[PDB]
Amino acid sequence: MAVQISKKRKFVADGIFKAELNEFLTRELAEDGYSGVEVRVTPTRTEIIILATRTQNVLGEKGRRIRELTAVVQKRFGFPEGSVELYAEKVATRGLCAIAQAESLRYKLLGGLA
């Protein structure tokens, strides 16, 4: 209807949100081996899962970093207060994750290993 946007634009915009959120999380949590983001969207709330190598690092002291990120992703995307939840999940078999191994390789080469 009039307020609602068409299905085509809605799905394109949802993909846009996925891409931007993934890029921001990549840049922010790159030094913690951020593998990827999986977003479960319900019409009531939005649940997002940061698949990372080090959950103990992506969530800070007492979860400070994860709640800080939750506030950040509220502010950017205009999500209403208390309508989005950020979870952090350890990636299974990280050796099989192409992004994680590339990040560890970047860390090694920055350190100065041959």
Partner: protein
């Protein structure tokens, strides 16, 4: 009460869309609600043709990106109420629901 609900399912991947429709019909049939057959709306193909090169030099090759949107309609028409009978929707990521009353 007399109530009739139209639920529309919209997604990108047919496997999960078919699963999330089939379990809805299968669940409601056990609860003895008159379910009209899942209507398959024609799929919407968003097609974007873009130059492969990021510069301009080349043999003028194009990429045909395709985004397919699949839409299903399910109608539950019970003589009694429907909201109290159906309170779970059993969603998986990617699929989006939209509740509608038959008045609309």
């Amino acid at each position: 009460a007399i109530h009739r609900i139209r639920i529309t399912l919209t997604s990108r991947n047919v496997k999960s869309l078919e699963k999330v429709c089939a379990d809805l019909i299968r669940g409601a049939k056990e609860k003895n609600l008159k379910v009209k057959g899942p209507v398959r709306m024609p799929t919407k193909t968003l097609r974007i043709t873009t130059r492969k090169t990021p510069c301009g030099e080349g043999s003028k090759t194009w990429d045909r990106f395709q985004m397919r949107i699949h839409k299903r309609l399910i109608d539950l028409h019970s003589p009694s109420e429907i909201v109290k009978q159906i309170t779970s929707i059993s969603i998986e990521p990617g699929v989006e629901v939209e509740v509608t009353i038959a008045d609309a």
